[PDB]
Amino acid sequence: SRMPVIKPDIANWELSVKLHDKVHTVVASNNGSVFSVEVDGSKLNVTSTWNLASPLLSVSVDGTQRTVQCLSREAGGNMSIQFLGTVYKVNILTRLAAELNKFMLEKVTEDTSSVLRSPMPGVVVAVSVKPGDAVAEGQEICVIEAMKMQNSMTAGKTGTVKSVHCQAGDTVGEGDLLVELE
Amino acid sequence: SRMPVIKPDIANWELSVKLHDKVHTVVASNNGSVFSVEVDGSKLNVTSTWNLASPLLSVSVDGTQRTVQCLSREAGGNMSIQFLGTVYKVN
Amino acid sequence: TSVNERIENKRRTALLGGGQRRIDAQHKRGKLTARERISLLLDPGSFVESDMFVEHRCADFGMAADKNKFPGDSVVTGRGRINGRLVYVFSQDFTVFGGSLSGAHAQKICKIMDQAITVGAPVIGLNDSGGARIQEGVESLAGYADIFLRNVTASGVIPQISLIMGPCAGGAVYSPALTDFTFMVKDTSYLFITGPDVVKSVTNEDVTQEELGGAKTHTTMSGVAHRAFENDVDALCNLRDFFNYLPLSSQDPAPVRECHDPSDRLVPELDTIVPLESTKAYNMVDIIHSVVDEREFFEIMPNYAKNIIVGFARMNGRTVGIVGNQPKVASGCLDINSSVKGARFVRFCDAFNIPLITFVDVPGFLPGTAQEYGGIIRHGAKLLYAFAEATVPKVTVITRKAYGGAYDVMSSKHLCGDTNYAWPTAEIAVMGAKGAVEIIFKGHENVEAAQAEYIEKFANPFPAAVRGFVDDIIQPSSTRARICCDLDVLASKKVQRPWRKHANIPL
Amino acid sequence: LRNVTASGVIPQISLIMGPCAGGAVYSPALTDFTFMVKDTSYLFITGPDVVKSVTNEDVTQEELGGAKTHTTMSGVAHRAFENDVDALCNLRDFFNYLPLSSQDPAPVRECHDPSDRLVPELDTIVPLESTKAYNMVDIIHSVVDEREFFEIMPNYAKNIIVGFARMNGRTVGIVGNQPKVASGCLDINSSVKGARFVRFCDAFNIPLITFVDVPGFLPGTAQEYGGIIRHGAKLLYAFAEATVPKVTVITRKAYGGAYDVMSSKHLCGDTNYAWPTAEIAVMGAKGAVEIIFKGHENVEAAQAEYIEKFANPFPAAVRGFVDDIIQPSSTRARICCDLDVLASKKVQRPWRKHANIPL
Amino acid sequence: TSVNERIENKRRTALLGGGQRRIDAQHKRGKLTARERISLLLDPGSFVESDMFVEHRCADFGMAADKNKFPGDSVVTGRGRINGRLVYVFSQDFTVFGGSLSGAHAQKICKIMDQAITVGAPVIGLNDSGGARIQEGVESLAGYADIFLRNVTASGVIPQISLIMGPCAGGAVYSPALTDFTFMVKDTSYLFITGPDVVKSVTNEDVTQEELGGAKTHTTMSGVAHRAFENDVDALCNLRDFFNYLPLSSQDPAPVRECHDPSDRLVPELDTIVPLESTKAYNMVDIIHSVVDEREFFEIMPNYAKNIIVGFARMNGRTVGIVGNQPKVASGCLDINSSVKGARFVRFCDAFNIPLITFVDVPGFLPGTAQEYGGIIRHGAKLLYAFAEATVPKVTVITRKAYGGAYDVMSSKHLCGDTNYAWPTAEIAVMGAKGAVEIIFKGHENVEAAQAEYIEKFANPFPAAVRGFVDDIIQPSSTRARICCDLDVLASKKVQRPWRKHANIPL
Ligand SMILES: *C(=O)CCCC[C@@H]1SC[C@@H]2NC(=O)N[C@@H]21
Ligand SMILES: *C(=O)CCCC[C@@H]1SC[C@@H]2NC(=O)N[C@@H]21
Ligand SMILES: *C(=O)CCCC[C@@H]1SC[C@@H]2NC(=O)N[C@@H]21
């Protein structure tokens, strides 16, 4: 009652939708329960109830019945949609964001998931592996117990062990290398 | 209680007192009920109760008993004093 | 030349800013300009620019030359809306005199701060500067003083959000210290008082720009920046979504927004998160994500003081603040760094009527000389005070451990809490059974029997609950529904407190 | 709960005269001042037995939580006294400074020290050579009534001085720089002590007197990694929020952002005086000329011209930054006059649920 | 040259001002300088000058030359005491650039106004200027705006007294219109918007300086100046004595000062002032002088709207305001001019907690087209409102006539008055007996008998007193003692009134 909110009068949504390696031009508008969407010149009508909390979203696209799942959503345009069983990664930007995003530096970072270091000082009480052992993602490798609390160190990469650098009985500090994966 | 008032620490009052056609130099100081006044080098002591509302002000000047009346007073220094029956205008 | 022609040329110059070649440098550098950033931040067509024709009045050192007369004087100021809600913004423009602060520069910023306070609208600043404009001398110092005065006056009246998207040096570095949240951009933003050139001249130590004041340092080690985002476009996209959580003024209730997530659903996933083994850690974040509306949680300082979690979320449409322990890191123990982050977050949420939900699992305090010499006593009192002072609804859930003085610090019911629930694994005690029995039963025979008797009676949630410390002991699957119910009835709760000129937090 | 509720309502003073462990250690953190007794008192959460069990470090009782540590290195205790009898004797005298409640004015007590006397000793304390340090305490002692000054944390953050004194009978709080230590520069530790002291004095209507001589901030990674930005904002806020009379005297240097942090007139100050040696600038003449005049010929002439015009107190005073430039010998009388007329000053501020200091 | 030598030379220049030759002109002209005037106004040794080293920052039109750098920039500002009581003053210095207003000029004045408001101290201005400093252009217009804003904000908070001791033109003429009292100096001061040169250029009329804006015009015909004094020395001597009447702030009670005049003495001189013959006028001033302490009365606007008397006096040491009719002039009838002066005086005294004493003797309103076309209805409502709004003690004495609507306008008991006394000659009626009988008894026989019956019953003070219009009918000799008693018991009286954003006087 103090600060009235005015709904933006948006007639059309002009989106730049990036799939695998192509950027598509999509224009959508809302007419209630149905979105009229033009995808690179093709007309589609997507009708639903659009209950955004349910894990299963049922939509009808030009009479075709589809069920999709939205698995993740980010403010940066990333959305993970499971469609026909396969998860597709789509990045949806507005026309303005897509035109300015071209000025961003394409920096390349390093994937440091094969190098497993101690996150916490203490004594190593178990190592589940030896060189050659298979390792799954989330697999417990080492168990360090300081301050009356068993802390499990897990792998971030699927692979095999190349070397076990710290053994059970050894005392390790923060940042020390425990196990090296392929 | 909000704005304390500080009494000016005036040790001496240096006045220029104009009578008929002469301007006299008078320096006065207060010691309670008595004013020690030097009038052009002459020492006088004026003692009174200095009740400023009464039409009759009784003063003692070096033992001499006088009665005076203040008939008018102005911010511009004008004061009309009746002294021995005659009104004198002093600025 | 007519008057209208002159005006049109003045508009085109203000839009260009410092010139196309300086814009080209900004884009080469992977940065957006100040005006492009506003277009992304605010609703399309909602932005109204103020004082676009203001110029500096300094005539010294050649500043009177026409070649130095840049309309706008290095800042873009104005008002707009984000999703229909009024907001005041400013963004510093680096292409004109390096983004340095002039007298008039500060002025323009101050004027929109005065309007925002008058109407009750938030202020978002996008900072990028090199420091004071030394050509004016002491006028830029007066500029800083006026901004600082507004930033302090606005505290507790409107929220103030600062995003740093470039270098920041000199007096400019203190405005983010006065606002409520500070965000940065990874590997693009810096925050330092003096540059590496001064550091090397004063002390015999080598350091580079990224090491002295980089975004990674301030989000991971100093605890100054609340979160760094990958780039300019992602930073503003997340900033819009963050904006949607906050009220426009402290006179407003926590925002309530349409929500499709049923408020009365059960969460069976909670019943088995907490292990029965006391030395097995678990991830508190799994509990937070499963309770909050649609599993959306905004985490603040993810890489600093990892043993305590603070952030924003929504339950049944209403914005709430969440604080909890992280047993995965340092057993969930409190230390200096965790107390600092907690007290600041709690204080903001209280000031702007945002309810608090606390998830307690804390075995005590981190021991050692590193904490004692650092003033752990002084800093721990910050979190205790921040909760005790609060007048907004407080709902606490105790998941497993709460030993010692940490029980009361983590928003116990005895600090004027509203509701406090325990899970079946909760244990509230002065200390664990092993320490307590060795101290209570000293020199007696058959201590092992005394140990069994003590554990059976006290190593559970009952000696606290039967005394009124806990309101109910609940199945974890019902936690969300229980909290939602409390939030929807405590929202209209008011309390009285004695008059005070101002609070006196231990600092 | 009571210690928090009482804050800003009544002053709370805690003296630790023995060991303190467990939850007890947090009540002094909620009260306004904490004092200790040398080599008799301790303040720790857990004992040395726990520390050695958790981490492989050796420590004794005096090292873990002794009075010397808390008054010199952690900044927790405001002052340690030699023994129990001396501690209580000084506590009684300290008590006499404070009001009984925040609803009361600063106490005023009979005073025999004339309020209008000159202090010739001040005129030559500050050297003309910019790299010669001096002791700020000589100025503080010569101004305050009967040369009595109660110093808080004498051994912690020595580059800033805070304490209590009386001028014309009225209790005042004093904050100032100490150029003798680290050139009088601000750092993390000095900002913490300053903000806490200022906040107490404001809450209980005790006027502030500030003696400014600050060349900037301590540079280096030790301060940047420690959050110097965050901590410096604490002192700026503590002054800006204040509603009690603030009188500032600038003795020599005030460079950069430190000018405003040390209670400048632009933070709603009442009076601000400069001594003839005061210099207010964004930076010193050497840095400013090298930046302003870059690549030009005859820079040495530009250096002389800049110093003659700006290396003094005039470019600030002519703008309204300074109310007067005063002879140091008159400082005490000038301050006494301001205190006796600002004491009834009230200001309005918008309503707030509570303050939000940067922490 | 050393730093100390430069400072000493800057002090000597500020003291000299515009130079000795310009001072010589001021003395030839019979005027004191701005600094000499302050020494006379304030207690010896109490004056502290602020910002003596401030100079203008305008560098255009040769203003950057050292020959134009006058420290003090044409104003003397600072604080002091009059009889130990704190006061803030400023005085405009005509010898530097003609006393014209610069940006910095206004600033210095604004700063002391801000202190005076903060501590609760009055401000006295001594004005003398030629107008804006056109060399700066629009900075002097901003200067005026800032002063005007302070003058409005201070209204009702601290009293503001202005004495004009020289010419005044341009925007400067509006500050005395915002302050509470304006005084002038005869044949030395002027107050006009434009000079005679503009008047003759616009309209074909001849006028000189003394006719267009002289002190005699503003004290006798326009009603702008409250009193003119003979010369500079007498003007400041009377100003000090005037100062002693007023409180320092509206938060203070009316000042009470040592008094030797017994509060319970009788005044036999009053019993025979009012004649029994209804067409014989008398001088109201004889009553005012005989009641007030030691027969001292400060009369405001002695030569304007002579049919109503307003001024200050003291009764039993306490400052009071006095308003009364003057039957000697226009039978004591109200007109436009008398209503304007009355409402303004009453409004000031109410705002600063100064009790009101009213002496009523008013037969009605001045008839004729001169008053009807002038808006007598609109202007008369000003005095009615000014009394009705008042919340300070009001004591009314009715000496002889109060006919018609004028009865209520002159602070009747029905406007929340405290006490109302009548003298034996008072008569309260809608109209006189002659008009009333001719209207009541129209067409009846033996009208002459009806005339005698009406006069005997109604031509006295009884039909009003028996109804509660009058509290007592008192012998005039007891008036002073009766008033003194009321003042000493109503001084602690407070009343409640509904909340209002601000008053809405008819204007
Ligand atoms: C082994 O004896 C070390 C015990 C540490 C257990 C934890 S660590 C922090 C808390 N403080 C404490 O005394 N116990 C808790
Ligand atoms: C030499 O170049 C070192 C200069 C340090 C001077 C002092 S130390 C702290 C202040 N910061 C700064 O840049 N200068 C001041
Ligand atoms: C003669 O009939 C003229 C009568 C005027 C008497 C006075 S003058 C103003 C008052 N108005 C009025 O009608 N009577 C009063």
PDB file of C-alpha atoms in Angstrom, chain C residues 60-61 132 134-135 137-142 144-146 148-149 152-157 173-174 177-178 180 191-194 198-199 202-203 205 207 211-213 217-218 221-224 250 304 340 343-344 347-348 350-351 353 365 367-369 372-378 380-382 384-385 388-389 391-392 414-416 497-507, chain D residues 1 4-5 7-9 25-26 29-30 32 43-46 50-51 54 57 59 63-65 69-70 73-76 102 192 195-196 199-200 202-203 205 217 219-221 224-230 232-234 236-237 240-241 243-244 256-257 260 264 266-268 280-283 288 291-293 306 309-310 315 319 321 349-359:
ATOM      1  CA  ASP C  60      42.629  25.152 -12.089  1.00  0.00           C
ATOM      2  CA  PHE C  61      45.435  23.180 -13.798  1.00  0.00           C
ATOM      3  CA  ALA C 132      40.048  10.946  -5.808  1.00  0.00           C
ATOM      4  CA  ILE C 134      43.667  15.174  -7.262  1.00  0.00           C
ATOM      5  CA  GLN C 135      43.303  18.137  -9.639  1.00  0.00           C
ATOM      6  CA  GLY C 137      42.363  18.709  -4.219  1.00  0.00           C
ATOM      7  CA  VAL C 138      40.169  18.864  -1.112  1.00  0.00           C
ATOM      8  CA  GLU C 139      36.806  19.080  -2.894  1.00  0.00           C
ATOM      9  CA  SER C 140      36.958  15.337  -3.546  1.00  0.00           C
ATOM     10  CA  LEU C 141      37.580  14.755   0.166  1.00  0.00           C
ATOM     11  CA  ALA C 142      34.425  16.721   0.951  1.00  0.00           C
ATOM     12  CA  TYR C 144      33.655  11.404   0.233  1.00  0.00           C
ATOM     13  CA  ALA C 145      32.507  12.921   3.511  1.00  0.00           C
ATOM     14  CA  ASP C 146      29.045  13.697   2.121  1.00  0.00           C
ATOM     15  CA  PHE C 148      29.787   8.590   3.918  1.00  0.00           C
ATOM     16  CA  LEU C 149      27.259  10.634   5.873  1.00  0.00           C
ATOM     17  CA  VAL C 152      25.488   5.890   7.533  1.00  0.00           C
ATOM     18  CA  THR C 153      22.182   7.764   7.735  1.00  0.00           C
ATOM     19  CA  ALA C 154      20.493   5.325   5.353  1.00  0.00           C
ATOM     20  CA  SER C 155      21.506   2.280   7.424  1.00  0.00           C
ATOM     21  CA  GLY C 156      18.455   0.488   8.758  1.00  0.00           C
ATOM     22  CA  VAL C 157      16.189   2.663   6.610  1.00  0.00           C
ATOM     23  CA  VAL C 173      36.909   1.508  -0.585  1.00  0.00           C
ATOM     24  CA  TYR C 174      34.925   2.558   2.472  1.00  0.00           C
ATOM     25  CA  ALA C 177      32.072  -1.123   4.125  1.00  0.00           C
ATOM     26  CA  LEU C 178      29.064   1.007   5.010  1.00  0.00           C
ATOM     27  CA  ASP C 180      24.834  -4.026   3.635  1.00  0.00           C
ATOM     28  CA  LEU C 191      39.543  -3.586  -3.625  1.00  0.00           C
ATOM     29  CA  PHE C 192      42.575  -2.044  -1.930  1.00  0.00           C
ATOM     30  CA  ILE C 193      43.496   1.187  -0.137  1.00  0.00           C
ATOM     31  CA  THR C 194      46.979   1.571  -1.634  1.00  0.00           C
ATOM     32  CA  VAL C 198      53.134   1.744  -2.068  1.00  0.00           C
ATOM     33  CA  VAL C 199      53.305  -1.649  -0.374  1.00  0.00           C
ATOM     34  CA  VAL C 202      56.951   0.782   2.661  1.00  0.00           C
ATOM     35  CA  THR C 203      57.827  -2.835   3.451  1.00  0.00           C
ATOM     36  CA  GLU C 205      57.518  -7.665   0.456  1.00  0.00           C
ATOM     37  CA  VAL C 207      52.918  -8.538  -4.250  1.00  0.00           C
ATOM     38  CA  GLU C 211      47.179 -10.887  -4.597  1.00  0.00           C
ATOM     39  CA  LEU C 212      46.821  -7.522  -2.881  1.00  0.00           C
ATOM     40  CA  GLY C 213      43.165  -6.820  -3.523  1.00  0.00           C
ATOM     41  CA  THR C 217      41.172 -12.858  -1.580  1.00  0.00           C
ATOM     42  CA  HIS C 218      38.171 -10.869  -0.353  1.00  0.00           C
ATOM     43  CA  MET C 221      40.311 -14.947   3.174  1.00  0.00           C
ATOM     44  CA  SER C 222      39.497 -11.456   4.439  1.00  0.00           C
ATOM     45  CA  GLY C 223      35.745 -11.918   4.625  1.00  0.00           C
ATOM     46  CA  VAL C 224      34.959  -8.586   3.000  1.00  0.00           C
ATOM     47  CA  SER C 250      12.644  -1.092   6.714  1.00  0.00           C
ATOM     48  CA  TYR C 304      34.604 -17.921   3.691  1.00  0.00           C
ATOM     49  CA  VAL C 340      31.722 -12.234  12.257  1.00  0.00           C
ATOM     50  CA  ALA C 343      26.366 -11.420  13.321  1.00  0.00           C
ATOM     51  CA  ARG C 344      26.396  -9.259  10.240  1.00  0.00           C
ATOM     52  CA  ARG C 347      21.617  -7.891  12.031  1.00  0.00           C
ATOM     53  CA  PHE C 348      20.569  -7.044   8.484  1.00  0.00           C
ATOM     54  CA  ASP C 350      16.379  -8.161  11.814  1.00  0.00           C
ATOM     55  CA  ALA C 351      16.530  -4.515  10.709  1.00  0.00           C
ATOM     56  CA  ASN C 353      11.795  -7.535   9.190  1.00  0.00           C
ATOM     57  CA  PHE C 365      34.237 -23.507  20.100  1.00  0.00           C
ATOM     58  CA  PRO C 367      40.204 -24.423  20.817  1.00  0.00           C
ATOM     59  CA  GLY C 368      43.774 -23.190  20.600  1.00  0.00           C
ATOM     60  CA  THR C 369      46.001 -20.154  20.918  1.00  0.00           C
ATOM     61  CA  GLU C 372      42.406 -17.086  22.056  1.00  0.00           C
ATOM     62  CA  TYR C 373      45.039 -14.565  20.904  1.00  0.00           C
ATOM     63  CA  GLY C 374      42.655 -13.412  18.208  1.00  0.00           C
ATOM     64  CA  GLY C 375      39.969 -12.386  20.668  1.00  0.00           C
ATOM     65  CA  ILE C 376      37.562 -15.305  20.291  1.00  0.00           C
ATOM     66  CA  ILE C 377      35.794 -14.033  23.433  1.00  0.00           C
ATOM     67  CA  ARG C 378      35.231 -10.632  21.966  1.00  0.00           C
ATOM     68  CA  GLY C 380      31.917 -14.711  19.824  1.00  0.00           C
ATOM     69  CA  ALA C 381      29.889 -12.125  21.717  1.00  0.00           C
ATOM     70  CA  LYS C 382      28.990 -10.596  18.340  1.00  0.00           C
ATOM     71  CA  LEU C 384      25.216 -13.857  20.764  1.00  0.00           C
ATOM     72  CA  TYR C 385      24.280 -10.167  20.721  1.00  0.00           C
ATOM     73  CA  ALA C 388      19.561 -11.567  21.484  1.00  0.00           C
ATOM     74  CA  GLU C 389      18.757  -8.094  20.100  1.00  0.00           C
ATOM     75  CA  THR C 391      12.779  -8.635  17.352  1.00  0.00           C
ATOM     76  CA  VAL C 392      11.751 -10.538  14.202  1.00  0.00           C
ATOM     77  CA  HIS C 414      16.054 -18.154  26.165  1.00  0.00           C
ATOM     78  CA  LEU C 415      17.043 -15.221  23.927  1.00  0.00           C
ATOM     79  CA  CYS C 416      13.352 -14.403  23.277  1.00  0.00           C
ATOM     80  CA  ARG C 497      11.985  -2.891  24.448  1.00  0.00           C
ATOM     81  CA  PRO C 498      13.236  -0.038  26.666  1.00  0.00           C
ATOM     82  CA  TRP C 499      14.241   3.196  25.005  1.00  0.00           C
ATOM     83  CA  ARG C 500      17.859   3.502  23.956  1.00  0.00           C
ATOM     84  CA  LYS C 501      19.764   6.203  22.155  1.00  0.00           C
ATOM     85  CA  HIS C 502      21.454   3.454  20.195  1.00  0.00           C
ATOM     86  CA  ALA C 503      22.726  -0.071  20.526  1.00  0.00           C
ATOM     87  CA  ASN C 504      26.120  -0.923  22.009  1.00  0.00           C
ATOM     88  CA  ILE C 505      27.288  -4.191  20.399  1.00  0.00           C
ATOM     89  CA  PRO C 506      30.610  -5.484  21.858  1.00  0.00           C
ATOM     90  CA  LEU C 507      32.528  -5.017  18.534  1.00  0.00           C
TER      91      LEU C 507
ATOM     92  CA  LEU D   1      19.697 -11.381  27.823  1.00  0.00           C
ATOM     93  CA  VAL D   4      22.199  -7.038  26.014  1.00  0.00           C
ATOM     94  CA  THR D   5      18.996  -5.335  27.165  1.00  0.00           C
ATOM     95  CA  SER D   7      23.244  -1.814  26.736  1.00  0.00           C
ATOM     96  CA  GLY D   8      22.810   1.893  26.128  1.00  0.00           C
ATOM     97  CA  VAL D   9      20.594   2.180  29.208  1.00  0.00           C
ATOM     98  CA  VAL D  25      33.847 -15.336  29.332  1.00  0.00           C
ATOM     99  CA  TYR D  26      31.078 -13.771  27.264  1.00  0.00           C
ATOM    100  CA  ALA D  29      32.187  -9.131  25.976  1.00  0.00           C
ATOM    101  CA  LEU D  30      28.709  -7.697  26.441  1.00  0.00           C
ATOM    102  CA  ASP D  32      31.186  -1.702  28.181  1.00  0.00           C
ATOM    103  CA  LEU D  43      40.231 -15.197  30.498  1.00  0.00           C
ATOM    104  CA  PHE D  44      39.922 -18.235  28.234  1.00  0.00           C
ATOM    105  CA  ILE D  45      37.177 -20.461  26.820  1.00  0.00           C
ATOM    106  CA  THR D  46      39.021 -23.774  27.209  1.00  0.00           C
ATOM    107  CA  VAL D  50      42.010 -28.970  25.738  1.00  0.00           C
ATOM    108  CA  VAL D  51      44.343 -26.951  23.525  1.00  0.00           C
ATOM    109  CA  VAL D  54      43.192 -30.753  19.969  1.00  0.00           C
ATOM    110  CA  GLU D  57      51.052 -26.937  20.424  1.00  0.00           C
ATOM    111  CA  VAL D  59      50.980 -23.500  26.103  1.00  0.00           C
ATOM    112  CA  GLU D  63      50.213 -17.576  27.805  1.00  0.00           C
ATOM    113  CA  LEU D  64      46.760 -18.846  26.882  1.00  0.00           C
ATOM    114  CA  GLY D  65      44.606 -16.354  28.732  1.00  0.00           C
ATOM    115  CA  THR D  69      47.967 -11.070  26.507  1.00  0.00           C
ATOM    116  CA  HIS D  70      44.502  -9.504  26.625  1.00  0.00           C
ATOM    117  CA  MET D  73      47.785  -8.405  21.972  1.00  0.00           C
ATOM    118  CA  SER D  74      44.147  -9.449  21.632  1.00  0.00           C
ATOM    119  CA  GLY D  75      42.640  -6.097  22.541  1.00  0.00           C
ATOM    120  CA  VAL D  76      40.038  -7.568  24.869  1.00  0.00           C
ATOM    121  CA  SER D 102      21.905   7.163  29.571  1.00  0.00           C
ATOM    122  CA  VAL D 192      38.581  -1.337  16.591  1.00  0.00           C
ATOM    123  CA  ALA D 195      34.980   2.771  17.391  1.00  0.00           C
ATOM    124  CA  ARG D 196      34.181   1.031  20.631  1.00  0.00           C
ATOM    125  CA  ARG D 199      30.184   4.485  20.666  1.00  0.00           C
ATOM    126  CA  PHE D 200      30.078   4.271  24.453  1.00  0.00           C
ATOM    127  CA  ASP D 202      27.922   8.875  22.444  1.00  0.00           C
ATOM    128  CA  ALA D 203      25.359   6.555  24.050  1.00  0.00           C
ATOM    129  CA  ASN D 205      25.990  11.830  26.425  1.00  0.00           C
ATOM    130  CA  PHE D 217      46.592   4.156   6.562  1.00  0.00           C
ATOM    131  CA  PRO D 219      50.023  -0.092   3.890  1.00  0.00           C
ATOM    132  CA  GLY D 220      50.821  -3.723   3.197  1.00  0.00           C
ATOM    133  CA  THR D 221      49.325  -7.162   2.725  1.00  0.00           C
ATOM    134  CA  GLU D 224      44.716  -5.722   3.293  1.00  0.00           C
ATOM    135  CA  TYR D 225      44.295  -9.458   3.983  1.00  0.00           C
ATOM    136  CA  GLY D 226      43.026  -8.606   7.439  1.00  0.00           C
ATOM    137  CA  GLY D 227      40.119  -6.558   6.143  1.00  0.00           C
ATOM    138  CA  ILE D 228      41.449  -3.047   6.745  1.00  0.00           C
ATOM    139  CA  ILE D 229      38.579  -1.769   4.568  1.00  0.00           C
ATOM    140  CA  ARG D 230      35.979  -3.433   6.693  1.00  0.00           C
ATOM    141  CA  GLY D 232      38.360   1.156   9.030  1.00  0.00           C
ATOM    142  CA  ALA D 233      34.676   1.711   8.324  1.00  0.00           C
ATOM    143  CA  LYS D 234      34.033   1.027  12.022  1.00  0.00           C
ATOM    144  CA  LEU D 236      34.111   6.321  10.369  1.00  0.00           C
ATOM    145  CA  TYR D 237      30.653   5.044  11.325  1.00  0.00           C
ATOM    146  CA  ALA D 240      29.265   9.801  11.834  1.00  0.00           C
ATOM    147  CA  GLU D 241      26.465   8.308  13.967  1.00  0.00           C
ATOM    148  CA  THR D 243      24.845  13.021  18.296  1.00  0.00           C
ATOM    149  CA  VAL D 244      26.873  14.373  21.238  1.00  0.00           C
ATOM    150  CA  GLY D 256      43.543  11.313   2.362  1.00  0.00           C
ATOM    151  CA  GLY D 257      40.442   9.495   3.509  1.00  0.00           C
ATOM    152  CA  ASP D 260      37.089  12.315   7.284  1.00  0.00           C
ATOM    153  CA  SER D 264      35.892  15.877  10.249  1.00  0.00           C
ATOM    154  CA  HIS D 266      31.493  17.092   7.423  1.00  0.00           C
ATOM    155  CA  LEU D 267      30.269  14.287   9.707  1.00  0.00           C
ATOM    156  CA  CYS D 268      28.005  16.741  11.596  1.00  0.00           C
ATOM    157  CA  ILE D 280      44.782  19.126   4.965  1.00  0.00           C
ATOM    158  CA  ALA D 281      45.194  17.511   1.552  1.00  0.00           C
ATOM    159  CA  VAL D 282      44.424  14.401  -0.479  1.00  0.00           C
ATOM    160  CA  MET D 283      48.114  13.546  -0.332  1.00  0.00           C
ATOM    161  CA  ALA D 288      50.414  15.315  -5.841  1.00  0.00           C
ATOM    162  CA  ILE D 291      50.755  13.055 -10.595  1.00  0.00           C
ATOM    163  CA  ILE D 292      49.390  16.495 -11.580  1.00  0.00           C
ATOM    164  CA  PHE D 293      52.457  17.581 -13.575  1.00  0.00           C
ATOM    165  CA  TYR D 306      52.355  23.768  -5.190  1.00  0.00           C
ATOM    166  CA  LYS D 309      50.037  27.376  -2.020  1.00  0.00           C
ATOM    167  CA  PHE D 310      48.750  24.053  -0.638  1.00  0.00           C
ATOM    168  CA  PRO D 315      42.996  25.736   1.124  1.00  0.00           C
ATOM    169  CA  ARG D 319      36.364  26.483   2.006  1.00  0.00           C
ATOM    170  CA  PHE D 321      36.506  22.951   6.466  1.00  0.00           C
ATOM    171  CA  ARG D 349      17.572  11.713  12.877  1.00  0.00           C
ATOM    172  CA  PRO D 350      15.165   9.497  10.898  1.00  0.00           C
ATOM    173  CA  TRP D 351      13.525   6.611  12.690  1.00  0.00           C
ATOM    174  CA  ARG D 352      15.360   3.308  12.603  1.00  0.00           C
ATOM    175  CA  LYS D 353      14.638  -0.044  14.158  1.00  0.00           C
ATOM    176  CA  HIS D 354      18.312  -0.244  15.002  1.00  0.00           C
ATOM    177  CA  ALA D 355      21.709   0.716  13.701  1.00  0.00           C
ATOM    178  CA  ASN D 356      23.598  -1.334  11.119  1.00  0.00           C
ATOM    179  CA  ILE D 357      27.334  -0.761  11.709  1.00  0.00           C
ATOM    180  CA  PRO D 358      29.557  -2.515   9.096  1.00  0.00           C
ATOM    181  CA  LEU D 359      31.137  -4.905  11.692  1.00  0.00           C
TER     182      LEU D 359
END
